[PDB]
Design an enzyme around this catalytic site. Structure first.
Site, mmCIF file in Angstrom:
data_model
loop_
_atom_site.group_PDB
_atom_site.id
_atom_site.type_symbol
_atom_site.label_atom_id
_atom_site.label_comp_id
_atom_site.label_asym_id
_atom_site.label_seq_id
_atom_site.Cartn_x
_atom_site.Cartn_y
_atom_site.Cartn_z
ATOM 1 N N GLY A 64 42.841 -67.802 55.227
ATOM 2 C CA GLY A 64 42.867 -68.396 56.363
ATOM 3 C C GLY A 64 42.995 -67.366 57.563
ATOM 4 N N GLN A 65 43.853 -66.635 57.663
ATOM 5 C CA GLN A 65 43.982 -65.685 58.706
ATOM 6 C C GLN A 65 43.073 -64.570 58.682
ATOM 7 N N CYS A 88 50.859 -69.554 52.997
ATOM 8 C CA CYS A 88 49.277 -69.566 53.124
ATOM 9 C C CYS A 88 48.503 -69.076 51.865
ATOM 10 N N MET A 89 48.527 -67.908 51.546
ATOM 11 C CA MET A 89 47.689 -67.051 50.564
ATOM 12 C C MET A 89 48.795 -66.703 49.121
ATOM 13 N N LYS A 98 34.994 -71.147 69.183
ATOM 14 C CA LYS A 98 36.308 -70.680 69.300
ATOM 15 C C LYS A 98 35.993 -69.184 69.500
ATOM 16 N N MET A 113 43.738 -74.512 51.663
ATOM 17 C CA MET A 113 45.305 -74.818 51.825
ATOM 18 C C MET A 113 45.493 -76.018 50.985
HETATM 19 N N1 MGD Z 1 39.949 -74.357 63.466
HETATM 20 C C1 MGD Z 1 40.838 -73.838 62.816
HETATM 21 N N2 MGD Z 1 40.339 -72.989 61.783
HETATM 22 C C2 MGD Z 1 41.186 -72.197 61.120
HETATM 23 C C3 MGD Z 1 42.737 -72.404 61.421
HETATM 24 C C4 MGD Z 1 43.122 -73.144 62.436
HETATM 25 O O1 MGD Z 1 44.087 -73.086 62.758
HETATM 26 N N3 MGD Z 1 42.216 -73.701 63.159
HETATM 27 N N4 MGD Z 1 43.727 -71.611 60.605
HETATM 28 C C5 MGD Z 1 43.071 -70.805 59.583
HETATM 29 C C6 MGD Z 1 44.123 -70.610 58.262
HETATM 30 S S1 MGD Z 1 45.529 -69.699 58.955
HETATM 31 C C7 MGD Z 1 43.844 -71.271 57.363
HETATM 32 S S2 MGD Z 1 45.389 -71.348 56.215
HETATM 33 C C8 MGD Z 1 42.636 -72.181 56.982
HETATM 34 C C9 MGD Z 1 42.927 -73.160 56.131
HETATM 35 O O2 MGD Z 1 41.685 -74.078 56.214
HETATM 36 P P1 MGD Z 1 41.845 -75.392 55.106
HETATM 37 O O3 MGD Z 1 42.705 -75.179 53.971
HETATM 38 O O4 MGD Z 1 40.272 -75.747 54.771
HETATM 39 O O5 MGD Z 1 42.496 -76.595 56.298
HETATM 40 P P2 MGD Z 1 43.106 -77.782 55.917
HETATM 41 O O6 MGD Z 1 42.843 -78.732 56.645
HETATM 42 O O7 MGD Z 1 44.549 -77.258 55.839
HETATM 43 O O8 MGD Z 1 42.646 -77.760 54.603
HETATM 44 C C10 MGD Z 1 43.385 -78.597 53.502
HETATM 45 C C11 MGD Z 1 42.492 -79.698 53.022
HETATM 46 O O9 MGD Z 1 43.441 -79.850 51.589
HETATM 47 C C12 MGD Z 1 42.969 -81.497 51.482
HETATM 48 N N5 MGD Z 1 44.355 -81.673 50.606
HETATM 49 C C13 MGD Z 1 45.076 -82.523 50.885
HETATM 50 N N6 MGD Z 1 45.948 -82.632 49.659
HETATM 51 C C14 MGD Z 1 45.296 -82.214 48.777
HETATM 52 C C15 MGD Z 1 45.460 -82.088 47.241
HETATM 53 O O10 MGD Z 1 46.439 -82.597 46.666
HETATM 54 N N7 MGD Z 1 44.488 -81.255 46.551
HETATM 55 C C16 MGD Z 1 43.408 -80.669 46.966
HETATM 56 N N8 MGD Z 1 42.388 -80.186 46.550
HETATM 57 N N9 MGD Z 1 43.081 -80.901 48.660
HETATM 58 C C17 MGD Z 1 44.107 -81.494 49.282
HETATM 59 C C18 MGD Z 1 43.166 -81.874 52.993
HETATM 60 O O11 MGD Z 1 42.616 -82.999 52.774
HETATM 61 C C19 MGD Z 1 42.618 -80.663 53.648
HETATM 62 O O12 MGD Z 1 41.176 -81.298 54.139
HETATM 63 O O13 MGD Z 1 42.085 -72.409 58.094
HETATM 64 C C20 MGD Z 1 41.801 -71.104 58.932
HETATM 65 N N10 MGD Z 1 40.818 -71.525 59.990
HETATM 66 N N1 MGD Z 2 52.462 -78.481 58.573
HETATM 67 C C1 MGD Z 2 51.556 -77.501 58.367
HETATM 68 N N2 MGD Z 2 52.210 -76.357 58.669
HETATM 69 C C2 MGD Z 2 51.384 -75.288 58.569
HETATM 70 C C3 MGD Z 2 50.088 -75.355 57.898
HETATM 71 C C4 MGD Z 2 49.644 -76.294 57.616
HETATM 72 O O1 MGD Z 2 48.615 -76.339 56.909
HETATM 73 N N3 MGD Z 2 50.610 -77.467 57.557
HETATM 74 N N4 MGD Z 2 49.595 -74.029 57.934
HETATM 75 C C5 MGD Z 2 50.358 -72.780 57.602
HETATM 76 C C6 MGD Z 2 49.642 -71.505 57.612
HETATM 77 S S1 MGD Z 2 48.383 -71.687 56.535
HETATM 78 C C7 MGD Z 2 49.622 -70.571 58.471
HETATM 79 S S2 MGD Z 2 48.663 -69.379 58.427
HETATM 80 C C8 MGD Z 2 50.722 -70.716 59.611
HETATM 81 C C9 MGD Z 2 50.187 -70.181 60.895
HETATM 82 O O2 MGD Z 2 51.146 -70.508 61.851
HETATM 83 P P1 MGD Z 2 51.868 -69.354 63.212
HETATM 84 O O3 MGD Z 2 51.185 -68.150 62.600
HETATM 85 O O4 MGD Z 2 53.170 -69.805 63.371
HETATM 86 O O5 MGD Z 2 50.676 -70.011 64.082
HETATM 87 P P2 MGD Z 2 49.877 -69.203 65.197
HETATM 88 O O6 MGD Z 2 49.465 -70.330 66.385
HETATM 89 O O7 MGD Z 2 48.719 -68.429 64.505
HETATM 90 O O8 MGD Z 2 50.841 -68.230 65.743
HETATM 91 C C10 MGD Z 2 50.396 -66.975 66.199
HETATM 92 C C11 MGD Z 2 51.251 -66.629 67.355
HETATM 93 O O9 MGD Z 2 51.095 -65.173 67.984
HETATM 94 C C12 MGD Z 2 51.022 -65.278 69.247
HETATM 95 N N5 MGD Z 2 50.252 -64.005 69.593
HETATM 96 C C13 MGD Z 2 48.817 -63.804 69.856
HETATM 97 N N6 MGD Z 2 48.392 -62.523 69.966
HETATM 98 C C14 MGD Z 2 49.499 -61.859 69.895
HETATM 99 C C15 MGD Z 2 49.577 -60.612 69.841
HETATM 100 O O10 MGD Z 2 48.579 -59.805 70.172
HETATM 101 N N7 MGD Z 2 50.830 -59.877 69.766
HETATM 102 C C16 MGD Z 2 51.631 -60.560 69.457
HETATM 103 N N8 MGD Z 2 52.997 -60.221 69.370
HETATM 104 N N9 MGD Z 2 51.882 -62.054 69.554
HETATM 105 C C17 MGD Z 2 50.816 -62.721 69.563
HETATM 106 C C18 MGD Z 2 50.532 -66.543 69.614
HETATM 107 O O11 MGD Z 2 50.425 -66.803 71.129
HETATM 108 C C19 MGD Z 2 51.000 -67.523 68.614
HETATM 109 O O12 MGD Z 2 52.493 -67.966 69.241
HETATM 110 O O13 MGD Z 2 51.238 -72.033 59.839
HETATM 111 C C20 MGD Z 2 51.521 -72.619 58.539
HETATM 112 N N10 MGD Z 2 52.242 -74.172 59.150
HETATM 113 S S1 SF4 Z 3 35.981 -65.600 62.613
HETATM 114 FE FE1 SF4 Z 3 36.317 -67.809 62.142
HETATM 115 S S2 SF4 Z 3 36.814 -68.557 64.449
HETATM 116 FE FE2 SF4 Z 3 35.969 -66.340 64.786
HETATM 117 S S3 SF4 Z 3 33.594 -66.960 65.169
HETATM 118 FE FE3 SF4 Z 3 33.966 -66.444 62.989
HETATM 119 S S4 SF4 Z 3 34.059 -68.458 61.971
HETATM 120 FE FE4 SF4 Z 3 34.552 -68.727 64.320
HETATM 121 MO MO MO Z 4 47.061 -69.740 56.789
#
Ligand code: MGD
Ligand code: MGD
Ligand code: SF4
Ligand code: MO
Ligand code: NO2
Length: 720
Positions: free
Chosen positions: A342-343, A137-138, A46, A305
């Site tokens: 995560g972010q 998230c956090m 990525k 998460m």
């Molecule tokens: N490729 C990729 N990487 C990312 C992101 C992305 O969109 N894509 N987003 C970023 C962001 S903002 C975030 S928040 C992080 C999140 O990164 P992670 O939290 O590592 O990603 P998830 O798959 O949401 O992880 C949730 C895990 O919790 C588990 N789970 C479900 N229920 C339970 C429970 O009851 N107890 C426990 N302990 N675990 C449970 C699920 O099996 C899952 O594997 O990733 C970050 N990195």
């Molecule tokens: N069901 C479920 N829902 C979830 C989660 C889950 O684990 N399960 N995870 C939650 C978590 S941990 C997170 S962090 C959130 C994240 O959810 P979001 O923050 O809603 O998802 P993103 O795709 O990161 O949104 C970023 C947006 O910013 C736009 N963007 C990119 N670059 C720029 C820029 O320079 N300027 C501006 N103004 N905009 C820009 C992108 O195109 C995109 O639409 O989702 C949450 N939602």
């Molecule tokens: S900040 Fe995350 S998505 Fe970007 S190169 Fe490092 S591990 Fe990959």
């Molecule tokens: Mo997140």
């Protein structure tokens, strides 16, 4: 090809890998990892394929209005748009007061962007209605750290990975979520094969493929499991009394002061043989987890998460810390309690800079009269200007949008119509006929733009300068590599012109660029325990990130927080080697939290746990990763994961089209049958915009952090 390399940060995860973006003729042509940042030159795929996203032509490059709800978005000029924005917010305020107006931001905004919006609303408009997606998230990790330690953020660093001999990885798919940090953990186990790895996760993910033990517990029972681990540790005399006697306090189930015996007596309800039946794991998994944890030289816990996206989220964090506090696996190299963020910037931008509804910059709280006054002094405000009660948290915010209590909203660098839980409710709320919604959005395919009345073209990523603070307390600068296309402007300048046109005092937004807001933010942090005043533009420009506290230009940064002679917030003459200075007596806290379950537990009608999760190839809503063809080939579309045993007796075969149904919606998805999900659990990813899974999830929140429980709801599956 590159004539020039420009230092910055990866736009994606909170691993916070430094990059060098190579440009020729004002165009980006190459990317590589910054050799001097923690990531030591390395990027995941990525990260290595950010240049095609930077170069994409599928951009919002001019301002846009919808003249009427349900109408088409039409080109408008910057001045018309800016005037439409200023007057609407201004006069909403004149009519209904400050609280009818809100900021919904992002942990993907630059720190400087978030800092300025937080000041416009809280100091300009006099409303605390500033929130954003780190709430989603956090928030639980913020409650966990505060209640246990009195301060937010980890006390250790990513360098600690190189020295742990035990890893307790819980509620975290590190392989897919934090790929370059998963590689450091794997590199550790490889340099030293005696390293133990416990992955505690209901799903069997690639993260478990380096584990010595994969604990596949029933969703919601990890609090019972971690209480049981504590029981084993104290039972077998593996605790650190020298540490918990001098450095720890105990609070019982009713939240009253207690002691070690009180702790011992509470834990008696959490005997391994009882808890194994509850968690649905073999009993020896508790003993071997507990033992690896306490018996190891240095133990690191990492979680994401699966722990935080829970109504018992903050209690779950307190429980990981209970484990480190009882054993003294803390405040020394390799041994630490380490929440994964995560972010790229939930930490620096919105957590540290208090761009949340209940907070003020640099460790400050809105109900704290003294903090308010000390921000009013620093921002040069009238007395009593900062409202005394916290604004709307994200779920409450969007509930108020629907009620019409909030009439104007800026949605910045987030996609709420795709990622907020219980989307049928949210969509309803977002379509309020009298709402004025402003989106600042780079990508025209963001599903939220469908609700937008005004759309502003923003400069994207390294099209401008700004700071990101990642999960390690490292604040790294990204310099500008290339010009923004079309009429895209940096959001910092956009926010200042808006503020000004809306009658905000010109003193409040006295910034020509991000460097000026940075210098002001540096001052707001000075003398606090986030103090990063020594982090000048000049040295952010030269270093590959500095880690806070960093209080003077000759300060190196801080690795071990709360350690005498390591952390500058610990007085050199302090009697004791540690000092948990966020608590009045310098002791950290063990909390004896009652273990419970999800807000929506399975039953006869809906017998399945349903979860949502990350896949490696996609970033959230896929507006960015969806523009790289390489990242589609493996995961173009949404799917549902089903357990082999479950599917074998429901008569579901691999790749059968099935219907996933909860109390809120029903959705058709291709089934994927495997041992990934433990028996009784199903899982969906949330990147596919044609399959909006958050329609299915409940939006119940943790009552302390107000984080939604995206991770557990009850569901059922039938063949379509
Ligand atoms: N490729 C990729 N990487 C990312 C992101 C992305 O969109 N894509 N987003 C970023 C962001 S903002 C975030 S928040 C992080 C999140 O990164 P992670 O939290 O590592 O990603 P998830 O798959 O949401 O992880 C949730 C895990 O919790 C588990 N789970 C479900 N229920 C339970 C429970 O009851 N107890 C426990 N302990 N675990 C449970 C699920 O099996 C899952 O594997 O990733 C970050 N990195
Ligand atoms: N069901 C479920 N829902 C979830 C989660 C889950 O684990 N399960 N995870 C939650 C978590 S941990 C997170 S962090 C959130 C994240 O959810 P979001 O923050 O809603 O998802 P993103 O795709 O990161 O949104 C970023 C947006 O910013 C736009 N963007 C990119 N670059 C720029 C820029 O320079 N300027 C501006 N103004 N905009 C820009 C992108 O195109 C995109 O639409 O989702 C949450 N939602
Ligand atoms: S900040 Fe995350 S998505 Fe970007 S190169 Fe490092 S591990 Fe990959
Ligand atoms: Mo997140
Ligand atoms: O990678 N989001 O499912």
């Amino acid at each position: 090809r590159p004539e020039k390399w420009v230092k910055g940060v990866c736009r994606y995860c909170g691993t916070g890998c430094g990059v060098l973006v190579g440009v020729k003729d004002g165009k980006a042509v190459a990317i590589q990892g910054d050799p001097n940042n923690h990531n030591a030159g390395l990027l995941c795929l990525k990260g290595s394929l950010l240049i095609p996203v930077l170069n994409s032509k599928e951009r919002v490059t001019q301002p846009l209005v919808r003249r009427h709800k349900g109408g088409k978005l039409e080109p408008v000029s910057w001045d018309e748009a800016l005037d439409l924005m200023a007057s609407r917010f201004r006069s909403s305020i004149d009519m209904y007061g400050p609280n009818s107006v809100a900021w919904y931001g992002s942990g993907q905004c630059l720190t400087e962007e978030s800092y300025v919006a937080n000041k416009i609303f809280k100091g300009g408009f006099g409303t605390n209605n500033v929130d954003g997606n780190p709430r989603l998230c956090m928030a639980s990790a913020v409650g966990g750290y505060v209640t246990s330690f009195g301060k937010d953020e980890p006390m250790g660093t990513y360098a600690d990975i190189d020295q742990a001999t035990c890893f307790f990885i819980i509620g975290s798919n590190t392989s897919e979520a934090h790929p370059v940090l998963f590689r450091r953990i794997a590199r550790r186990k490889q340099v030293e094969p005696g390293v133990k790895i416990i992955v505690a996760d209901p799903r069997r993910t690639n993260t478990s493929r380096i584990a010595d033990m994969h604990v596949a517990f029933r969703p919601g029972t990890d609090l019972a499991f971690m209480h049981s681990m504590a029981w084993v540790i104290i039972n077998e005399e593996l605790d650190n009394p020298r540490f918990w006697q001098r450095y720890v306090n105990f609070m019982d189930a009713e939240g009253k002061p207690s002691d070690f015996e009180g702790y011992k007596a509470f834990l008696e309800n959490y005997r391994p043989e009882k808890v194994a039946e509850i968690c649905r794991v073999p009993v020896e998994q508790i003993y071997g987890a507990a033992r690896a944890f306490a018996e190891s030289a240095a133990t690191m816990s990492l979680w994401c998460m699966g722990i935080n996206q829970r109504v018992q989220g903050v209690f779950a964090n307190n429980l990981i810390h209970n484990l480190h506090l009882i054993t003294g696996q803390i405040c020394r190299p390799g041994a630490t309690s380490f929440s994964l963020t995560g972010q790229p910037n939930a930490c620096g931008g919105v957590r540290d800079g208090g761009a949340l509804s209940h907070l003020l910059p640099a460790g400050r709280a809105i109900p704290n009269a003294k903090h308010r006054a000390e921000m009013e002094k620093l921002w040069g405000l009238p007395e009593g200007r900062i409202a005394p009660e916290p604004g709307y948290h994200t779920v409450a915010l969007f509930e108020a949008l629907g009620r019409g209590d909030v009439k104007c909203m800026i949605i910045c660098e987030t996609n709420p119509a795709h990622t907020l839980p219980n989307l049928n409710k949210v969509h309803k709320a977002m379509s309020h006929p009298e709402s004025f919604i402003v989106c600042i959005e780079a990508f025209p395919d963001a599903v939220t733009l469908e609700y937008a009345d005004l759309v502003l073209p923003p400069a994207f990523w390294c099209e401008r300068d700004g700071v990101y603070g990642c999960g390690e307390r490292r604040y790294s600068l990204t310099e500008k590599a290339v010009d923004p296309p079309g009429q895209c402007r940096p959001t910092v300048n956009t926010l200042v012109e808006f503020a000004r046109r809306a009658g905000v005092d010109p003193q409040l937004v006295n910034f020509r660029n991000a460097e000026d807001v940075w210098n002001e933010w540096r001052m707001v942090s000075k003398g606090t325990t986030y103090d990063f005043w020594g982090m000048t533009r000049e040295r952010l420009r030269k270093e590959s990130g500095l880690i806070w506290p960093c209080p003077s230009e000759d300060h190196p940064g801080t690795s071990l927080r709360y350690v005498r002679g390591q952390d500058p917030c610990v007085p050199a003459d302090h009697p004791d080697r540690f000092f948990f200075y966020g608590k009045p007596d310098g002791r950290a806290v063990i909390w004896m939290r009652p273990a419970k379950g999800a807000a929506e537990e399975p039953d006869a009608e809906y017998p399945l746990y349903l979860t949502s999760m990350r896949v490696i190839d996609h970033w959230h809503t896929a507006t960015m990763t969806g523009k790289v063809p390489e990242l589609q080939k493996a995961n173009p579309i949404a799917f549902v994961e089903i357990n082999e045993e479950d599917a074998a007796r429901t008569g579901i075969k691999h790749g059968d089209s099935v219907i996933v149904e909860t109390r809120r919606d029903a959705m058709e998805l291709p089934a994927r049958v495997s041992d990934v999900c433990r028996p009784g659990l199903i899982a969906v990813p949330f990147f596919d915009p044609k399959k909006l899974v958050n329609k299915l999830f409940l939006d119940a929140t943790d009552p302390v952090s107000r984080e939604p429980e995206y991770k557990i709801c009850a569901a059922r599956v039938r063949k379509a």
